[PDB]
């Protein structure tokens, strides 16, 4: 009748344990596809809004107790949000806004790990880069990452060919534009022979118009090109037009002559 | 005694392409500015291309991208290389030589016919 009684020694909780999901928002968000990032005990009434909050990831049930883990399983990021920027890698979204820190009742969206490293932002961005919606500092940072994509995958420098040959039809029609004036500055940075002759072939297929305004030191008048033989030096050292001429819509050649002066 | 002879010159169609010689006589490339005008029948000379005595080049804005001047100083023969030729570059190509920092010492020399339809 008398029953040999004998309670469990004190328990003593683990990190694991004492983990909160409320409070990992900095801790979920960094991890990588099919990366289990455990979130301690949950309760099943706070079951769907981690769902809610995280729904690029899947919630487990690793241990008793209620110890669930998130695991990876989608990168929603949209592109406008994710490639018209350098270093804003995820992102919430309340209602229909969207804040880069945490909010309660946002939801969670991550971009792409190497997204400007893929060629999935040359859509978006050949886009968003004309017209009103060009970026002085995000524009000219994609064409150099444009030049230095190590994507060797076949579909990445696939892409990336096809955004050259639009580039080269889209600067061939109008140069002036700003999108291309950074594409002829990042091929003069480039000093390769590739791109020295596709700066001259956009230039040299542009209108008289574009070029009586901005190409006034390559295609000098009868006048400044019969004295310019009266002086032994190149007419690029003397030239007032080229002295003042802005150095992405020069020719190779008097690029190269400009540097011959003193 | 300075002498500018030339030659190159032929028959060819809108589309075709030429080259131009000028060998050198008592002249050299180290201090003199080469020119290759052209000057149409009953028209003013104008010139085509010109380049420094340290090769720099410089071209006019019609013959701009078409027309590329060389020069060989080892051998005194500047060139002229009509490419992608026109109608209307139909004219009397002759050669021009003038002293660096000497404007009155200025030479000129033979011309060559060329023609395209």
């Known amino acids: 009748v008398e029953l040999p009684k004998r309670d469990p020694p004190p328990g003593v909780p683990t990190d694991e344990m004492l983990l909160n999901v409320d409070k990992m928002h900095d801790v979920i968000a960094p991890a990588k596809l099919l990366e289990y990032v455990h979130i301690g005990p949950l309760a099943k009434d706070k079951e769907d809004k981690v769902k809610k909050r995280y729904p690029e990831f899947r919630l487990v049930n690793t241990g008793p107790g209620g110890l669930s883990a998130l695991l990876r399983q989608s990168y929603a990021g949209t592109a406008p949000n994710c490639c018209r920027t350098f270093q804003r890698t995820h992102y919430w979204k309340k209602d229909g806004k969207i804040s880069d820190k945490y909010e309660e009742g946002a939801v969670l969206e991550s971009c792409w790990p190497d997204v400007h490293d893929t060629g999935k932002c040359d859509v978006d961005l050949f886009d968003w880069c004309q017209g009103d919606t060009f970026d002085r500092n995000i524009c000219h940072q994609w064409i150099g990452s444009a030049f230095n994509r190590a994507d060797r995958t076949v579909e990445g420098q696939q892409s990336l060919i096809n955004l050259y040959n639009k580039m080269q039809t889209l600067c061939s029609k109008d140069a002036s534009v700003p999108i291309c004036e950074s594409f002829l500055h990042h091929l003069r940075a480039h000093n390769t022979e590739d791109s020295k002759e596709m700066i001259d072939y956009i230039l040299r297929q542009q209108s008289a118009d574009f070029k009586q305004k901005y190409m006034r030191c390559s295609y000098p008048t009868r006048d400044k090109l019969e004295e310019s033989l009266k002086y032994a030096e190149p007419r690029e050292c003397w030239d007032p037009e080229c002295s003042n001429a802005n150095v992405n819509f020069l020719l190779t050649r008097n690029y190269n002559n400009l540097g011959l002066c003193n | 005694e300075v002498q500018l002879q030339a030659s190159g010159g032929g028959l060819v169609q809108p589309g075709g392409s030429l080259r131009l010689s000028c060998a050198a006589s008592?002249?050299?490339?180290?201090?003199?500015?080469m020119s290759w005008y052209r000057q149409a029948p009953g028209k003013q000379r104008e010139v085509v291309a010109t380049?420094?005595?340290?090769?720099?080049?410089d071209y006019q804005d019609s013959v701009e991208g078409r027309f590329t001047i060389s020069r060989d100083m080892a051998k005194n023969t500047v060139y002229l290389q009509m490419n992608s030729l026109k109608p209307e570059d139909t004219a009397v190509y002759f050669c021009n030589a003038r002293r660096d920092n000497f404007a009155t010492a200025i030479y000129w020399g033979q011309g060559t016919q060329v023609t395209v339809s």
């Open positions: 008592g002249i050299v490339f180290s201090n003199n500015r």
């Open positions: 380049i420094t005595s340290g090769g720099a080049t």
